[PDB]
C-alpha cells in the first residue's frame, strides 16, 4: 500500500535511501496487535485514530491527554495519516501527567499494569509497549521494563535526547528492551539522540508530523518520536508474523538499513528501522 506525500519518517522506514515521499507498507498495517502507549494518555476521540484508540488506565484524575505528547506518539504508532501501523489497537496508559512528567513508581506500576492487563485484551498478533520516556539510571525501572519484556510484550523505549551514552538512562539502558535512537531526514544521527552500545536501532525522530490534541497535528522531534516508529514497526512486523515480542528488537536490527546513518559514534550501531517492504 502506499501513502503519497507521507510524513518523511514514514517514507524513510519503507526506503533504503533518504529523500523519498511515499510510505509503502503492507495493508495489514498492524491489525491484530496492540500497542500500549505508556505516556500522557491519548485523545482517543481524535478522528485520526478512527476509534482504534482507548484509554485503559490512568494514574491521574482524568484519563485525558492534556499534553499531546501521548497523542503524538500514539499517532506515529498508528493514526491513519501519520502512523506506521494504521490499524493497530492503541491503549493508553497515562503514567504521565499533562506536563509530561511522572514518578518511577507510577511508570513502573503502568508497566506491571500492562504486563497484567494484556492478559484481558484481545491482541492476537502481539503486544507492544511504547515508552517515549525515561530518566536517569534506575535498576527498578530497568527491572520493570525487563519484567514487561519478559511477560511477553515488545518493549520499545526511547534512548533519550541528551546526545549521550544511553547507558545512563532508564529504561533505555535495560539491555533486554529495544533502545531506539533518532535520525533526521538526511540520514544523520539526530543531533539530540543518545547513542552508545545499548542502542539497538535508530528511527526517524527529527520533525515528525503526527496527531495532536484538539483534533489537530503538529511536527515535533525526539527519540520519543523514533520510539513509536519502531513500536509501530514492531507491531506491523508482529501482525505480519515476521517476529515476536521477544525477538522483535533483534529482528528490527538484523533487517535495518546498515551503515546509512552518519554521525554514528564508534561503539554505536549504524542501523535504521526498515520495514523492508516489497510491493
Amino acid at each position: 500500500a502506499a501513502q503519497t506525500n507521507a510524513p518523511w519518517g514514514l517514507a524513510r522506514i519503507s526506503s533504503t535511501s533518504p529523500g523519498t515521499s511515499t510510505y509503502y507498507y503492507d495493508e495489514s498495517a498492524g491489525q491484530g496487535s496492540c500497542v500500549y502507549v505508556i505516556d500522557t494518555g491519548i485523545e482517543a476521540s481524535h478522528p485520526e485514530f478512527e476509534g482504534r484508540a482507548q484509554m485503559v488506565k490512568t494514574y491521574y484524575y482524568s484519563s485525558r491527554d492534556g499534553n499531546g505528547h501521548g497523542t503524538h506518539c500514539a499517532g506515529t504508532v498508528g493514526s491513519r495519516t501519520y502512523g506506521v501501523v494504521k490499524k493497530t489497537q492503541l491503549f493508553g496508559v497515562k503514567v504521565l501527567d499533562d506536563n509530561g512528567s511522572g514518578q518511577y513508581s507510577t511508570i513502573i506500576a503502568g508497566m506491571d499494569f500492562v504486563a497484567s492487563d494484556k492478559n484481558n485484551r484481545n491482541c492476537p498478533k502481539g503486544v507492544v509497549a511504547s515508552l517515549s520516556l525515561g530518566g536517569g539510571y534506575s535498576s527498578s525501572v530497568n527491572s520493570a521494563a525487563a519484567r514487561l519484556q519478559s511477560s511477553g510484550v515488545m518493549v520499545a523505549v526511547a534512548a533519550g535526547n541528551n546526545n549521550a551514552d544511553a547507558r545512563n538512562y532508564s529504561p533505555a539502558s535495560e539491555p533486554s528492551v529495544c533502545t531506539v535512537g533518532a535520525s533526521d531526514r538526511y540520514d544523520r544521527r539526530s543531533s539530540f539522540s543518545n547513542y552508545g552500545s545499548v542502542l539497538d536501532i535508530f528511527g526517524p525522530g527529527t520533525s515528525i508530523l503526527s496527531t495532536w490534541i484538539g483534533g489537530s497535528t503538529r511536527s515535533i522531534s525526539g527519540t520519543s518520536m523514533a520510539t513509536p516508529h519502531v513500536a509501530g514497526l514492531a507491531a506491523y512486523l508482529m501482525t505480519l508474523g515476521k517476529t515476536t515480542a521477544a525477538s522483535a528488537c533483534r529482528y528490527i536490527a538484523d533487517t535495518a538499513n546498515k551503515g546509512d546513518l552518519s554521525n554514528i559514534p564508534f561503539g554505536t550501531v549504524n542501523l535504521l528501522a526498515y520495514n523492508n517492504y516489497q510491493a
Binding site: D39, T40, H69, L96, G100, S101, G102, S132, L133, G134, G135, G136, A158, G160, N161, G222, T223, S224, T227
Partner: peptide, 4 residues
C-alpha cells in the same frame, strides 16, 4: 526525569 520524564518524556523522551
Amino acid at each position: 526525569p520524564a518524556p523522551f
